[PDB]
Design a protein around this motif. Structure first.
Motif, PDB file in Angstrom:
ATOM      1  N   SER A  20      -0.911  -5.172  26.804  1.00 12.20           N
ATOM      2  CA  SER A  20      -2.291  -5.621  26.655  1.00 12.20           C
ATOM      3  C   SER A  20      -2.955  -5.746  28.020  1.00 12.20           C
ATOM      4  CB  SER A  20      -2.344  -6.961  25.916  1.00 12.20           C
ATOM      5  OG  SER A  20      -1.626  -7.963  26.612  1.00 12.20           O
ATOM      6  N   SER A  21      -4.283  -5.668  28.029  1.00 14.56           N
ATOM      7  CA  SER A  21      -5.059  -5.714  29.264  1.00 14.56           C
ATOM      8  C   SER A  21      -6.211  -6.695  29.137  1.00 14.56           C
ATOM      9  CB  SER A  21      -5.621  -4.329  29.586  1.00 14.56           C
ATOM     10  OG  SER A  21      -4.590  -3.360  29.638  1.00 14.56           O
ATOM     11  N   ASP A  22      -6.836  -7.002  30.267  1.00 15.77           N
ATOM     12  CA  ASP A  22      -8.025  -7.839  30.273  1.00 15.77           C
ATOM     13  C   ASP A  22      -9.111  -7.139  29.460  1.00 15.77           C
ATOM     14  OD1 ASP A  22      -9.090 -10.281  32.288  1.00 15.77           O
ATOM     15  OD2 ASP A  22     -10.663  -9.010  31.429  1.00 15.77           O
ATOM     16  N   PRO A  23      -9.859  -7.891  28.630  1.00 11.82           N
ATOM     17  CA  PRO A  23     -10.915  -7.254  27.830  1.00 11.82           C
ATOM     18  C   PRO A  23     -11.921  -6.490  28.686  1.00 11.82           C
ATOM     19  CG  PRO A  23     -10.546  -9.481  27.070  1.00 11.82           C
ATOM     20  CD  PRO A  23      -9.729  -9.325  28.317  1.00 11.82           C
ATOM     21  N   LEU A  24     -12.093  -6.929  29.928  1.00  5.60           N
ATOM     22  CA  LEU A  24     -12.990  -6.266  30.864  1.00  5.60           C
ATOM     23  C   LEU A  24     -12.458  -4.873  31.195  1.00  5.60           C
ATOM     24  CD1 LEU A  24     -14.566  -8.190  33.866  1.00  5.60           C
ATOM     25  CD2 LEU A  24     -14.547  -5.703  33.673  1.00  5.60           C
ATOM     26  N   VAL A  25     -11.148  -4.781  31.402  1.00  2.00           N
ATOM     27  CA  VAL A  25     -10.506  -3.512  31.735  1.00  2.00           C
ATOM     28  C   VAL A  25     -10.526  -2.564  30.540  1.00  2.00           C
ATOM     29  CG1 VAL A  25      -8.355  -2.402  32.478  1.00  2.00           C
ATOM     30  CG2 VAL A  25      -9.027  -4.610  33.445  1.00  2.00           C
ATOM     31  N   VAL A  26     -10.310  -3.108  29.345  1.00  2.00           N
ATOM     32  CA  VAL A  26     -10.379  -2.312  28.125  1.00  2.00           C
ATOM     33  C   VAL A  26     -11.782  -1.740  27.972  1.00  2.00           C
ATOM     34  CG1 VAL A  26     -10.157  -2.306  25.605  1.00  2.00           C
ATOM     35  CG2 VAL A  26      -8.626  -3.716  26.996  1.00  2.00           C
ATOM     36  N   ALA A  27     -12.782  -2.573  28.241  1.00  2.00           N
ATOM     37  CA  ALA A  27     -14.176  -2.157  28.158  1.00  2.00           C
ATOM     38  C   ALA A  27     -14.468  -1.029  29.142  1.00  2.00           C
ATOM     39  CB  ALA A  27     -15.091  -3.341  28.427  1.00  2.00           C
ATOM     40  N   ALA A  28     -13.993  -1.185  30.374  1.00  2.00           N
ATOM     41  CA  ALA A  28     -14.232  -0.202  31.424  1.00  2.00           C
ATOM     42  C   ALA A  28     -13.545   1.123  31.120  1.00  2.00           C
ATOM     43  CB  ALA A  28     -13.761  -0.741  32.763  1.00  2.00           C
ATOM     44  N   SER A  29     -12.378   1.052  30.491  1.00  2.00           N
ATOM     45  CA  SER A  29     -11.639   2.253  30.127  1.00  2.00           C
ATOM     46  C   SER A  29     -12.381   3.046  29.057  1.00  2.00           C
ATOM     47  CB  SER A  29     -10.239   1.887  29.636  1.00  2.00           C
ATOM     48  OG  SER A  29      -9.488   1.273  30.668  1.00  2.00           O
TER      49      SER A  29
ATOM     50  N   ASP B 189      -2.808  -2.162  27.889  1.00  2.00           N
ATOM     51  CA  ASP B 189      -3.205  -1.648  26.588  1.00  2.00           C
ATOM     52  C   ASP B 189      -2.990  -0.136  26.583  1.00  2.00           C
ATOM     53  OD1 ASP B 189      -5.190  -2.824  24.173  1.00  2.00           O
ATOM     54  OD2 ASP B 189      -5.197  -0.641  24.423  1.00  2.00           O
ATOM     55  N   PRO B 190      -2.459   0.420  25.478  1.00  2.00           N
ATOM     56  CA  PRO B 190      -2.237   1.873  25.433  1.00  2.00           C
ATOM     57  C   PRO B 190      -3.509   2.671  25.705  1.00  2.00           C
ATOM     58  CG  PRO B 190      -1.147   0.824  23.593  1.00  2.00           C
ATOM     59  CD  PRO B 190      -1.962  -0.243  24.260  1.00  2.00           C
ATOM     60  N   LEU B 191      -4.655   2.085  25.376  1.00  4.66           N
ATOM     61  CA  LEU B 191      -5.943   2.716  25.622  1.00  4.66           C
ATOM     62  C   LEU B 191      -6.183   2.840  27.125  1.00  4.66           C
ATOM     63  CD1 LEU B 191      -9.090   1.782  23.518  1.00  4.66           C
ATOM     64  CD2 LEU B 191      -9.187   3.045  25.668  1.00  4.66           C
ATOM     65  N   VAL B 192      -5.846   1.785  27.861  1.00  2.00           N
ATOM     66  CA  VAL B 192      -6.029   1.764  29.309  1.00  2.00           C
ATOM     67  C   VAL B 192      -5.061   2.726  29.993  1.00  2.00           C
ATOM     68  CG1 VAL B 192      -5.949   0.329  31.394  1.00  2.00           C
ATOM     69  CG2 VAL B 192      -6.850  -0.611  29.257  1.00  2.00           C
ATOM     70  N   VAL B 193      -3.829   2.784  29.493  1.00  3.04           N
ATOM     71  CA  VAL B 193      -2.842   3.720  30.018  1.00  3.04           C
ATOM     72  C   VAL B 193      -3.339   5.146  29.820  1.00  3.04           C
ATOM     73  CG1 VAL B 193      -0.468   4.582  29.854  1.00  3.04           C
ATOM     74  CG2 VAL B 193      -0.945   2.147  29.520  1.00  3.04           C
ATOM     75  N   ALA B 194      -3.897   5.409  28.643  1.00  3.25           N
ATOM     76  CA  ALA B 194      -4.438   6.723  28.322  1.00  3.25           C
ATOM     77  C   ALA B 194      -5.576   7.091  29.269  1.00  3.25           C
ATOM     78  CB  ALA B 194      -4.922   6.751  26.882  1.00  3.25           C
ATOM     79  N   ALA B 195      -6.480   6.144  29.498  1.00  5.23           N
ATOM     80  CA  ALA B 195      -7.640   6.374  30.352  1.00  5.23           C
ATOM     81  C   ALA B 195      -7.234   6.605  31.801  1.00  5.23           C
ATOM     82  CB  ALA B 195      -8.600   5.202  30.258  1.00  5.23           C
ATOM     83  N   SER B 196      -6.180   5.924  32.235  1.00  2.68           N
ATOM     84  CA  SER B 196      -5.683   6.079  33.594  1.00  2.68           C
ATOM     85  C   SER B 196      -5.105   7.473  33.808  1.00  2.68           C
ATOM     86  CB  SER B 196      -4.625   5.019  33.899  1.00  2.68           C
ATOM     87  OG  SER B 196      -5.185   3.718  33.842  1.00  2.68           O
ATOM     88  N   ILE B 197      -4.376   7.969  32.816  1.00  2.00           N
ATOM     89  CA  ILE B 197      -3.790   9.301  32.891  1.00  2.00           C
ATOM     90  C   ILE B 197      -4.886  10.363  32.933  1.00  2.00           C
ATOM     91  CG2 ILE B 197      -2.417  11.015  31.644  1.00  2.00           C
ATOM     92  CD1 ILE B 197      -0.727   8.636  30.589  1.00  2.00           C
ATOM     93  N   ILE B 198      -5.876  10.224  32.056  1.00  2.00           N
ATOM     94  CA  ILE B 198      -6.990  11.165  31.998  1.00  2.00           C
ATOM     95  C   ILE B 198      -7.749  11.179  33.322  1.00  2.00           C
ATOM     96  CG2 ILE B 198      -9.213  11.691  30.895  1.00  2.00           C
ATOM     97  CD1 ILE B 198      -8.010  10.428  28.312  1.00  2.00           C
TER      98      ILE B 198
END
Ligand SMILES: [Ca+2]
Ligand SMILES: [Ca+2]
Ligand SMILES: [Ca+2]
Ligand SMILES: [Ca+2]
Ligand SMILES: [Ca+2]
Ligand SMILES: [Cl-]
Lengths: 25, 25, 25, 25
Positions: C1-10, D3-12
């Motif tokens: 899991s990540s900070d909601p801010l980071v999820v938003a930015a992603s 968050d898997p979403l953030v991991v995905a965004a980082s790779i992209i």
């Protein structure tokens, strides 16, 4: 929660986008 | 804390911004 | 899991990429 | 971990940078 470094980078990234949009507008 | 991959990507992203600014200046 | 801010930015980052690609195509 | 979403965004994001560099070179 995230690493403070990642939180920092996310904030910088968003502000960069906002400034670019305002510049274009 | 974050995935080491995400930490890596955040660092690369910031350095990319700094290099771009220094190039423009 | 990540900070909601980071999820938003992603999410914003990905959508920005998709819009740019669709614009180019 | 992130968050898997953030991991995905980082790779992209990284792959986007690499492709841009290879295109310029
Ligand atoms: Ca975490
Ligand atoms: Ca740390
Ligand atoms: Ca992992
Ligand atoms: Ca928080
Ligand atoms: Ca989730
Ligand atoms: Cl994260």
């Amino acid at each position: 929660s995230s690493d403070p470094l990642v939180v920092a980078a996310s904030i910088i990234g968003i502000l960069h986008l906002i400034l670019w949009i305002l510049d274009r507008l």
